[PDB]
Design a protein around this ligand. Structure first.
Ligand code: DHT
Lengths: 251, 9
């Protein structure tokens, strides 16, 4: 559907720029300070995710209702995947590189009160190291995450979504073979990377549970949620936890 | 609103 050297050019050109959390690293870390900063980081990243998705070819040809649905449900996965890439490129996946001014070591993972989820996210980052994911594969795979979760009743124009998603799957397939392999080695690589994408979903589901817990207790825990974060978490996350969405896997 | 505001820009 779209030439392989062109696709990578478009994806590189629209890739969001670095965003800082704005965290005061001179302060002592508390659960509330770290979680509020992550909430603030998510709001800042979410603004870039919308601008990014709008520039993804074919996305804005969806009905605006479906565009809302896709961003509302997939923003967690897109951000966690990009975070794993950042940790791979910056600290060789030894720490969680949420932002240049918000890097989690073991101490911050403990005081965040989601230590086990942080460990799971570092394991995801380590898969980048073991697989030696290219930047070209990363960009194609991240684009696919916009097409990873849909309502159980489907979208307004499900058929167009189906073909656009199939298209972006083909783009990943073509990028892998574009890089010199035999067809056997390219077929294994496609399975590895799609299995990597599917491994995101259990992590994302736990993160959706965790963020709804924080939101419910935000006042008592002194954990602040920015405005757009609150609008999505108070609307689409409950539907996710109610089983009203389905992940679109590969394996 | 808000997410819709960003998409309509
Ligand atoms: C997406 C963020 C912020 C962006 C990023 O790099 C990944 C990270 C993953 C955990 C999230 C956080 C946003 C805010 C969240 C949702 C907290 O509420 C609980 C888990 C956090």
């Amino acid at each position: 559907s779209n030439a392989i050297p062109i696709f990578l050019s478009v994806l590189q050109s629209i890739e969001p720029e670095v965003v800082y959390a704005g965290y005061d690293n001179t302060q002592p870390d508390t659960s509330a300070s770290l979680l509020t900063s992550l909430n603030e980081l998510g709001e800042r990243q979410l603004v870039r995710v919308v601008k990014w998705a709008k520039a993804l070819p074919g996305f804005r040809n969806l009905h605006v209702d479906d565009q809302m649905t896709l961003i509302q449900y997939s923003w967690m996965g897109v951000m966690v995947f990009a975070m794993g890439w950042r940790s791979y490129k910056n600290v060789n996946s030894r720490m969680l590189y949420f932002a240049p001014d918000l890097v989690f070591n073991e101490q911050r993972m403990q005081k965040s009160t989601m230590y086990n989820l942080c460990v799971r996210m570092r394991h995801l980052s380590q898969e980048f190291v073991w697989l030696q994911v290219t930047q070209e594969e990363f960009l194609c795979m991240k684009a696919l995450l916009l097409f990873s979760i849909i309502p159980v009743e489907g979208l307004k124009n499900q058929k167009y979504f189906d073909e656009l998603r199939m298209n972006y799957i083909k783009e990943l397939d073509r990028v892998i073979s574009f890089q010199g392999k035999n067809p056997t080695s390219s077929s294994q690589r496609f399975y590895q990377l799609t299995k990597l994408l599917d491994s995101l979903q259990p992590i994302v589901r736990k993160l959706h549970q965790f963020t709804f817990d924080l939101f419910v207790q935000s006042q008592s825990l002194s954990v602040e949620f920015p405005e757009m974060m609150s609008e999505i978490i108070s609307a689409q996350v409950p539907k996710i936890l109610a089983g009203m969405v389905k992940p679109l896997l590969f394996h | 609103a808000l997410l819709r505001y960003l998409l309509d820009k």
